[model samples]
Target chain A: ADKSMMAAVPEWTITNLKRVCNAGNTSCTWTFGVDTHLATATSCTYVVKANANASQASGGPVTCGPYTITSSWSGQFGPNNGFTTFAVTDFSKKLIVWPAYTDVQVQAGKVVSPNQSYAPANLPL
Target chain B: PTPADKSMMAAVPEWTITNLKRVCNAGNTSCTWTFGVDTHLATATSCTYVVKANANASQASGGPVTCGPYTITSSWSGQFGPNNGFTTFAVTDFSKKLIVWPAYTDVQVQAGKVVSPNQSYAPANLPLE
Candidate 1:
């Protein structure tokens, strides 16, 4: 199994935002140890499915709604590098994500001010 | 006769700098004036008021304020007027003076609505900034 299976590793900053389809802390578990040598690379899709209903084989369960965010960062490590995506739906008839970090994408107008310095050049800038 | 009455003048020996700044064009004009070294000022007389110009023109005019401090090797006193467009910047003529103003006397205090602060320079009772 370990040889023929290639899995994805994702760093999650899990969040269940507003009632926009009630998406927050969806069970997000991913494999971290990467083994590239395999037959094929299959991506695990995190979709919006209602809570598991028992006594039904093959997990015959209905989808609540589009929750919008397929996955999310727990609000750490920093910006959404566009490596994340979503397809959300819900009971409230809405789709949204929140605690959205502002323009953490483009690092503009960044300045570095240092009070003390010591280096090979041995001079302050 | 008293020392004040003996002569109608008193030259007590003091350095007075004249601030002269004017306007001109291609006209070859000469703005000549003098820095006066006087002892006292009661009235105009010989040793009472002796003024000399930077360039000695042998008249009660000045020449220009150039170079060094009051221990001037050259002077500008008495009467130095303009020949063509020679300019004087009492405030503008030179920069090192302490005080410089009142350049032209034939100017309206408030005329033409818009006038210049440039005055005709005349050596005062003291040196300029």
Candidate 2:
């Protein structure tokens, strides 16, 4: 039996997640790297889901290409808690996959992406 | 002031201060003043802030707080006022431009109320060393 015809699909993981805020706390930017770089992968869709105590908000599906990804959200954030998850769809396979969700903590008028959990643990680049 | 000090003052970037508010704790024993600063510069630079109570009755200064090479706006906070029966408080930039409440004389530090309101600035001279 030839196993080469049934090879397993490679798993992609999000890594090196971080967040920074503007001096006025008006906007924050998030940057992360994805393992198993796909040069043709054009963009990613992400959403921020606030915890029970936080105000709910959502963002792109934006233009973050290649491997390293960057996205920004505008508006006053924090004094609350949330989590962010990212997804990339395979055009060829017509399938969607998500990396582990990163826990977001907003306090003292600042936003931070701390630990990644759920599904699979994120890696460092 | 020497010519050097005047030159330094002239070189100070056009920084704007806004959203000045002072809120006191429930006990009125402590208060925090927060304001927004815009350096309006394309590069990061060091800036300092000075706080004065009632015509310099009490004063404190801090920084070399760095400001914008990226985002031009920065927020500052200090816990230094509403004491010594000081009905008036003012904040100044490195250039010594005074940001004060318009009706500062009547401002009171009441618990759970933003006592300082109506913002205005006055020109002052601060010598640089």
Candidate 3:
């Protein structure tokens, strides 16, 4: 049999987007991914904006690369009472991508949040 | 609720396995498995990984497995028959609580190659339990 040829498309697709909190919504962790495979880009940055309406406390511009595939950030964002937005920007292209905002209540209750689609530069925050 | 009640709340660290893949040899007699473990808010320096290849009734596990602040990647090879079956991979903290839920996949190897349609589960982004 011939070797299976898997597609090697170089694109930005978010993987493992999550916002998880403790039992009481005290502190939460946000993790995300931008799968950059066989691409010319070297690195990308991601940021988390908590309580978008109020403090809008931002977490990172954390760097991830083609090899890194995923990155994470965690902290105590007050009461976890509102929505949190996760965004990733391609370092080379300067394009940004993010998943739908996650509700703090849903996250704290350990619900499985929505997965991100491969929509590049589709900023909906 | 009192001010002290709010102060009592704490965050639990979580772990997850990412970039998981299985590649077979030319003869399809053995295969190489690779993946990464990500730790969030984890105070411990290392974690353990457990992988099972149910088709051949084989198991592989190891770690004090450490990662840089957030993630670490690792790989190993095993003698799995040409047609390997369902496989499971998991990572846990020192206390043995699963940081991320276990990941399961059905892989097919033919003639020393991964014949399954989806060889990598990176896009699934398996979440924390």
Candidate 4:
């Protein structure tokens, strides 16, 4: 499986997501062989995220993290395919994150959502 | 509401079981099984999941095949079905009120008060196609 949708991680602030080799340990990544998101900035490293519940951002009373989610500018965004991993130590304490999409538009940004709301951005689809 | 039988859910030795709680995206294709190892939701395509079915209620021709999670996924967040949600089964005889993804393929799992007492599960030792 190349790219699969991730489960919802509701409370964390994810930024600086870098896919490390972790000494050939890629167990932390989800396989996206389905309708998954593809990130626009592949080189950028971030942490703590959400994707399964991305649709919730456009709804009422959004209470997720206040982060601006960014994705590719156009077309249906599907994962490039492959397994990736993030540092678990960095994700341990607070803010449970979910990798639900490739891009996001968080609070105080173009969408102007709550500070903790992490909604997806740049979806021409 | 038929509560999920914990003893039965815990009896499955082959599976990495848990306390039978509702997951973030529980029942949807995006749901995760976070007991022993976290599949982390919608991440892994072939991970098997197990959840107890509410005892006493079954959908459609509904007989006992009662269910457990042991599920496979093509998409990770939506209702489960043998005809619609994919290969499904049931886990009857449990200790707490339990349910599975409904039969509608379009239905999704949300963060609050989602529906319950639906038919969905995979039998033990079943093979996935």
After superposition, the stretches of candidate 2 with alpha carbons farther than 4 Å from their true spots are A1-7, A37-56, A66-81, A100-125, B1-129
Off by over 4 Å in 3: A1-11, A22-26, A36-56, A66-81, A104-106, A109-114, A122-125, B1-129
Q: Per-residue lDDT for A16 in model 4?
A: 29
Clashing pairs in 3: B28-B112
lDDT of 3 by residue, B33-80 (tens): 554443434443433333234343223322323443322222222212
Report the lDDT tens digits of candidate 3 across residue range A1-125.
11111123333544444555444434445555545544543423343334432223445435566221222222212243233334444434533433334354234434233323433421111
Ten consecutive residues with minimal summed lDDT in candidate 1 chain B? B1-10
TM-score of chain A of each: 0.18, 0.44, 0.46, 0.18
The best-first sequence of candidates by TM-score reads: 3, 2, 4, 1
Candidate 1 or 2, higher lDDT?
A: 2
Candidate 2 chain B: worst 10 consecutive residues by lDDT? B70-79
List each candidate's DockQ score: 0.00, 0.01, 0.02, 0.01
Residue by residue across B98-122, what tens digits does model 4's lDDT show? 2122111222222322333221121
Flag the better candidate by TM-score, 2 or 3. 3
The Cα RMSD of model 2 versus the native structure comes to: 23.4
What tens digits encode model 4's per-residue C-alpha lDDT throughout A37-84?
Answer: 232211222322234332221211112233222221111112221111
For model 2, the local distance difference test gives 0.30
**Model 1 Cα shift for residue A105 (angstroms):** 44
Q: Which structure is stronger by DockQ: 2 or 4? A: 4
**DockQ leaderboard ranking:** 3, 4, 2, 1
Model 2, B1-129: lDDT tens digits are 212101111233333444445554444343444545444443323333233333321222222132332111111111122331222222233234211111121133233243333232222222211
